[PDB]
Design a protein around this nucleic acid. Structure first.
Lengths: 105, 1106, 176, 42
RNA sequence: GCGGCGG
DNA sequence: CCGCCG
């Protein structure tokens, strides 16, 4: 399983869509002015994507590298830096289906 | 020092006012120096009357155009970013169909730029030039058919561009073709439309051509007159009203499309002569009487039937013949846009004639300055034609002030069609230098004009020739039109003359671009001078006659990139124009009238003319040129001196003693060194740097602005949020940096302060500020620092605060600060110099006088040019200059050798002989003979065939010196260099190529925010691009990691570049790059959209990039 | 090695009532050949200041008891009227050539460093002529002519050079 | 980066539709929204 | 974006 | 093609 020898392009099963997904963005809330911090179930929420900070979690129960792969008991936040943050995806659950312009035009 | 000049072809008339092209153009352009009374009504006035009698009944007429009070003065315009424009209004009076004519005596509608005494303009703070242009002179011509080798087609070209582009083709299998806008229609059809009936027509037209059968073709449409006018409308491609909408026909009558160029010469010239003969009106213009007159349409076909038939004259028109190409003087270009503005203005004034209440409308209601200003403004500042004045050195400016371009409006000529135009045509003789064009793409497309070449009444570059009736030559000259030159048989000026009479039976002359040996009785015209054949710029190379045309170009162009050296020296050997260039260009300041000197300050010279007047001439001290070069005027006159009219008061940027000088004359040995002069390397003697021989002063203009953010005005003060006082020293003046201060890379030139990380205070930086010192100025340090590279010495400063005296401060811009920084440019290893012949090269090694090639007598050389660069390239001229230059050293004298008429091989050996009595004559007396070294090289010289065996060393060496070679001892070994080596005074220059622009060395720095790239722009530099060409380069090598390294560790892998940096800091081995952020970013970019891009294992399975 | 004019801040400036520019001047100063007499004179600072209608020559420097100026008539500058020229020129004893950018002398914060031209010789030439004495004709008659600005003498030089040579010869002593 | 604006659009309508389904479902409205919807996705 | 320019 | 200035 060591070297990447082949790359594959296949269609996306809705089930797999939720598979790569971490939480679902449910509101058009980018970032509220008062606090540089993202709003709630917005686009920049940290649970759906991940920790806004470097190796510390949301409230501060676990703050270093000794417990790197452990999730906090009170709020789910496992972390390394702000880049393992930009590797997770979220999904939007569409009411009535729509189509891939790519497959139609 | 004595100045001897060897010219034998009596130069009959002095060169003309070099900048005349530009100067006079604008004068005749805006006849603004003389009353509305004086005749000359072209340009401004003309374009005025063209569209001034406005007949909407509405009647607004023109009176007089007056203007003259310049808002501010020259320099002020420069110091303040102001465009040096004059104010222009004009008396107008609007009439009514009722009783009453109100005249609003003044409507200032625009501000037109002015022309310096040198010829340049000052648009926004900077000096620019309106370069001349060429095109097919709106007329009528006949060119061979495209593919069909059979018959030729007729063209009818009128500008401006909106006007039609007519062609007349004949395809016997069914039609006679007339095209306008790409659609063909029966040539006859229009003919009928005019009145020409089948009968009259064919009989006077079809005298000799059966072709006519092709015209009497209408036995159906040709029987209905005025109905054919309606029939021709149908012809228009779109569905419109049959009747009156004859507008499209109205358009080809007398107003807009055909041309309104001066009645009689503009188009009519290409009429009378080339085809038919008379022009009623201005163009095929007549909508009068309901019936139309086109004394043009029929003859164009009349010549078509002549051309295709007999020999009425051999009508085949050679496109490039300058007799069919015009040059657009600035005046014309500017006047052009002007009437475009006039039109745009008249456009809205007609609208406001209907919106009209009553008689109560005159100035305001009719006139709006909006169109005309944007118009003109647009030209001078937007047109691809007026540009940044190339002022590397005066000469430079002057050329750029006089060259011709093909590219432009686009209607004249484009880019991908040129192999034909790029050629120096037969006609360019004395009208377009054949050498001034630039190398690489764009060649032969953009070229400077000839010596005597002056633009006539309508653009065809005229050249001067001497009349000669019988075997007699006059002192009477005439500037012929390219076309008119072919009618005669002109002869060269090298032709021997005993005074006012020809000298040999078989004498050279050129009929029509064809070399022919003619007789004394047949010579009708003779060339004025060889000079006229080339350009000013070209006319500066000493022995051009011995230099390949190809390299000669490099040579001419090179001079334009010469740089002002503190110690300016004129060429030991000059062409004879150096004096003039400086003159006509305005570098140096001359004395108007005769008189005496009063004050000779280093800032101003005040003289007292003998006519009871006393003036003060201020000297531009040390101004910053457009290219960043020193421009000072050093007085060359002493207090109380009787000056001759037109005598140099002070020397210009590169003119000393009134002569043009760019670089210096150095003693040069022409031979090979270890390899320091390998390919095109040049070796230099430390000894040069010692006497500040090659030193240019340079200036860079850094600038910063105190912008007005909605977060808080940016203040310019001595206060810098980061607390350092040692870096605040130089910045003594609260905000500005002190004059005379030494600014290095990274120092603060000017201080400024703006608001924090956009909108909100940082909740993380509010806890850090509060811990150590809560009371920390919330303002940030945004200061104009010394950009990596260099700065030098601050020498002038400019600040523009609130109460603006008369400056145009952009919006949002609170106040502006300019800082001029200078430094001394001593010649160093990376610098590149070159001679007027084309030998260009960089300094390879700066040698200690100690061990460099010295002559018998202690005198060492200054530079060693590798001989090998002379054979391949063909430019003997330099080796010549060197020889003469050798006499000049020991004879202490400068010479002036004309282009093709200059010094000759015998005469030089003559002066060289003289030089031997100075070099070796003092040697005999001083008390010493020949060295055992000199004897030794003489042996190898005689066995070489340089000297005549059997003569005395004395005699020998002389004969050897005469060849232009002397002896030379190494310097390192003190041993001679077997074989005489030629040496001499060669004029060489330093170019606008300091290595200052040559070494961006990057370690680490800034990255783009949107795209991950090490772009520079701050204290940090950019990293060179790698391009695919260069990757392949690596690929072929099998340079895996070296390539991997380029793609990731050095660029995109943010995290990767990190590990690497750290690693290197630890003296460790850089980390292994796992996945380019480009790889992962792709996966996602592909997830973001349908496609599930999944990476796989050996056995088709998952793997995680993330 | 360095100069300082009273109302001039940078080398590229101009002084009222004075024809020559600061650079035309400092240029002429490197042409100044002074002459010390004892090692105790490592760095001398000549002072000069004349006003009004006059021609400043190198002779107008206020004398310094131990050192002499063999370069008297050197033209330093020309003054119109009210030509206020006062300056201090730093001079040193050195060797070879040195770029004003290499040493960067700073007596006063507003003084400008000049280029170093230490070699006291302008040109050297040696000639080898036929024999005068001996039983064979194949012999050398070396006579070398040397040219000095004045600081030291032809002989002085010759000797020092001769010494430097010898000095190096000895360096072939201890092997390794 | 600009894409968010478009992301907000989709989120909005998709959401506005969830609600426009639970509140009451008048046909003409349901479609006029699915429309916008389909356009957003594109 | 457009002019210029080096190889 | 690669590069740099305004």
């Amino acid at each position: 399983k060591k070297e990447v020898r082949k790359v594959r392009i296949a269609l996306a099963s809705p089930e797999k869509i939720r598979s790569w997904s971490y939480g679902e963005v449910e509101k058009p809330e980018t970032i509220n002015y008062r606090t540089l911090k993202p709003e709630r179930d917005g686009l920049f929420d940290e649970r759906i994507f991940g920790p806004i900070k470097d190796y510390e979690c949301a409230c501060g129960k676990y703050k270093r590298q000794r417990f790197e792969g452990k999730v906090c008991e009170r709020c789910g936040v496992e972390v390394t830096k702000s880049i393992v943050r930009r590797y997770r995806m979220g999904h939007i659950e569409l009411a009535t289906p729509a189509a891939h312009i790519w497959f139609v035009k | 020092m004595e100045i001897k000049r060897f010219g034998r072809i009596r130069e009959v008339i002095p060169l003309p006012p070099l900048t005349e092209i530009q100067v006079e153009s604008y004068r005749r352009a805006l006849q603004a120096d003389v009353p509305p009374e004086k005749r000359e009504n072209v340009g401004i006035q003309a374009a005025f009357r063209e569209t001034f009698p406005i007949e909407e009944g509405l009647v607004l007429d023109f009176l007089e155009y007056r203007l003259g009070e310049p808002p501010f003065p020259q320099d002020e315009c420069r110091e303040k970013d102001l465009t040096y424009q004059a104010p222009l209004y004009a008396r107008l009076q609007l009439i009514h169909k009722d009783t009453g004519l109100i005249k609003e005596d003044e409507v200032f509608l625009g501000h037109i730029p002015l022309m310096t005494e040198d010829g340049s303009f000052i648009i926004n703070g900077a000096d620019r030039v309106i370069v001349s242009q060429i095109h097919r002179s709106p007329g009528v011509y006949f060119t061979p058919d495209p593919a069909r080798p059979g018959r030729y087609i007729a063209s009818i070209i009128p500008l401006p561009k909106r006007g039609p582009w007519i062609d007349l083709e004949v395809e016997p299998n069914g039609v006679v073709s007339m095209k306008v806008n790409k659609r063909k229609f029966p040539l006859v059809l229009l003919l009928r439309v005019l009145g020409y009936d089948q009968e009259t027509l064919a009989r006077e037209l079809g005298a000799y051509g059966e072709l006519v059968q092709g015209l009497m073709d209408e036995s159906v449409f040709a029987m209905r007159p005025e109905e054919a006018l309606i029939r021709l409308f149908t012809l228009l491609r779109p569905g419109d009203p049959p009747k009156r909408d004859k507008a499209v026909a109205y358009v080809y009558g007398l107003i807009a499309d055909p041309r309104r160029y001066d009645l009689g010469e503009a188009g009519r010239y290409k009429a009378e002569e080339k085809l038919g003969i008379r022009l009623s009106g201005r163009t095929l213009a007549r909508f009068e009487d309901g019936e139309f007159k086109d004394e043009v349409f029929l003859p164009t076909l009349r010549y078509l039937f002549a051309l295709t038939a007999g020999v009425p004259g051999h009508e085949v028109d050679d496109i490039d013949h300058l007799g069919n190409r015009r040059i657009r003087t600035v005046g014309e270009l500017m006047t052009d846009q002007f009437r475009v503005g006039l039109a745009r203005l008249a456009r809205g004034v007609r609208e406001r004639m209907l919106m009209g209440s009553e008689d109560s409308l005159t100035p305001a209601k009719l006139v709006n300055s909006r169109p005309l200003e944007a118009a003109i403004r647009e030209f001078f500042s937007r047109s691809q034609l007026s540009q940044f004045k190339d002022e590397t050195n005066p000469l430079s400016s002057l050329r750029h002030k006089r060259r011709i371009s093909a590219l432009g409006p686009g209607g004249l000529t484009r880019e991908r069609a040129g192999f034909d135009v790029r050629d120096v045509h037969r006609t360019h003789y004395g009208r377009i230098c054949p050498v001034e064009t630039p190398e690489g793409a764009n060649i032969g497309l953009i070229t400077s004009l000839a010596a005597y070449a002056r633009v006539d009444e309508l653009g065809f570059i005229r050249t001067p020739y001497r009349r000669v009736v019988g075997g007699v030559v006059t002192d009477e000259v005439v500037y012929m039109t390219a076309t008119e030159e072919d009618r005669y048989t002109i002869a060269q000026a090298n032709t021997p003359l005993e005074g006012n009479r020809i000298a040999a039976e078989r004498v050279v002359a050129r009929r029509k671009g064809e070399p022919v040996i003619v007789s004394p009785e047949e010579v009708e015209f003779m060339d004025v001078s060889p000079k006229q054949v080339f350009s000013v710029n070209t006319n500066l190379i000493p022995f051009l006659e011995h230099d390949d045309a190809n390299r000669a170009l490099m040579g001419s162009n090179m001079q334009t990139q010469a740089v002002p050296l503190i110690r300016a020296q004129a060429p030991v050997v000059m062409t004879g124009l150096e004096e003039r260039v400086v003159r006509d260009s305005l570098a140096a300041l001359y004395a108007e009238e005769d008189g005496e000197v009063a004050k000779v300050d280093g800032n101003r010279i005040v003289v007292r003319y003998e006519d009871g007047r006393l003036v003060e001439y201020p000297l531009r001290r040390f101004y910053r040129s457009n290219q960043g070069t020193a421009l000072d005027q050093r007085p060359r006159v002493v207090v109380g001196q009787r000056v001759r009219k037109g005598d140099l008061l002070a020397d210009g940027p590169a003119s000393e003693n009134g002569f043009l000088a760019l670089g210096q004359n150095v003693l040069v040995a022409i031979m090979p060194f270890d390899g320091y002069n390998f390919e095109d390397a040049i070796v230099i003697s430390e000894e040069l740097l010692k006497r500040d021989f090659y030193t240019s002063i340079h200036i860079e203009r850094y600038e910063i602005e105190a912008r007005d953010t909605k977060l808080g005005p940016e203040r310019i003060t001595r206060d810098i949020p980061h607390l350092s006082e040692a870096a605040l020293r130089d910045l003594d003046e609260e905000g500005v940096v002190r004059i005379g201060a030494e600014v290095k890379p990274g120092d603060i030139l000017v201080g400024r302060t703006s608001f924090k990380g956009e909108s909100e205070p940082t909740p993380e930086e509010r806890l850090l500020r509060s811990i150590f010192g809560e009371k920390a100025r919330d303002v940030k340090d945004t200061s104009l620092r010394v950009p990596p590279g260099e700065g030098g010495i601050v020498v002038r400063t400019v600040r523009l605060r609130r109460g603006d005296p008369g400056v145009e401060l952009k919006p949002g811009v609170r106040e502006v600060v300019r800082v001029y920084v200078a430094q001394k440019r001593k010649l160093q290893v990376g610098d590149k110099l070159a001679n007027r012949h084309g030998n260009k090269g960089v300094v390879a090694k700066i040698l200690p006088v100690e061990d460099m090639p010295h002559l018998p007598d202690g005198t060492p050389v200054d530079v060693i040019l590798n001989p090998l660069g002379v054979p391949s390239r063909m430019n003997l001229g330099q080796i010549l200059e060197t020889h003469l230059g050798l006499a000049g050293y020991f004879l202490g004298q400068r010479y002036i050798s004309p282009i093709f008429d200059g010094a000759k091989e015998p005469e030089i050996k003559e002066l060289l002989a003289q030089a031997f009595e100075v070099y070796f004559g003092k040697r005999k007396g001083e008390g010493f003979g020949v060295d055992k070294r000199e004897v030794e090289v003489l042996r190898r010289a005689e066995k070489l065939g340089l000297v005549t065996p059997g003569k005395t060393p004395e005699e020998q060496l002389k004969e050897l010196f005469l060849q232009g070679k002397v002896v030379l001892y190494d310097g390192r070994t003190g041993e001679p260099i077997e074989g005489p080596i030629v040496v001499g005074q060669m004029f060489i220059m330093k170019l606008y190529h300091m290595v200052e622009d040559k070494m961006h060395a990057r370690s680490t720095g800034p990255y783009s925010l949107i795209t991950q790239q090490p772009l520079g722009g701050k204290a940090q530099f950019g990293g060179q691009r790698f391009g695919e060409m260069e990757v392949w380069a690596l690929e072929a090598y099998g340079a895996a990691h070296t390539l991997q390294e380029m793609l990731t560790l050095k660029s995109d892998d943010i995290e990767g570049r990190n590990a690497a940096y750290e690693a290197i800091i630890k003296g460790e081995d850089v980390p292994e790059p796992s996945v380019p952020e480009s790889f992962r970013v792709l996966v996602k970019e592909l997830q973001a959209l349908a496609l599930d891009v999944q990476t796989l294992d050996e056995k088709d399975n998952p793997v995680d990039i993330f | 090695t360095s100069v300082y004019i009273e109302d001039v801040l940078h080398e590229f400036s101009t002084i009222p009532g004075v024809k020559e520019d600061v650079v035309e001047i400092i240029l002429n100063l490197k042409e100044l050949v002074v002459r010390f007499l004892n090692p105790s004179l490592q760095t001398v600072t000549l002072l000069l200041k004349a006003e009004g209608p006059k021609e400043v020559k190198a002779r107008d420097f206020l004398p310094v008891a131990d050192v002499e100026i063999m370069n008297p008539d050197l033209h330093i500058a020309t003054l119109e009227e009210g030509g206020r020229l006062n300056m201090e020129v730093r001079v040193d004893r050195g060797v070879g050539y040195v770029p004003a950018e290499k040493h960067g002398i700073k007596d006063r914060i507003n003084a400008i460093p000049v280029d170093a031209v230490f070699s006291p010789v302008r040109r050297v030439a040696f000639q080898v002529e036929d024999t005068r004495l001996g039983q064979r004709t194949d012999l050398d008659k070396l006579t070398l002519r040397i040219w000095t600005d004045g600081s030291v003498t032809p002989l002085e030089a010759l000797n020092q050079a001769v010494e430097i040579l010898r000095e190096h010869l000895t360096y072939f002593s201890n092997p390794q | 980066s600009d894409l968010n604006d478009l992301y907000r659009r989709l989120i909005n309508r998709n959401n506005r539709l969830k609600k426009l389904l639970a509140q009451g479902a008048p046909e003409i409205i349901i479609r006029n929204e699915k429309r916008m919807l389909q356009e957003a996705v594109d």
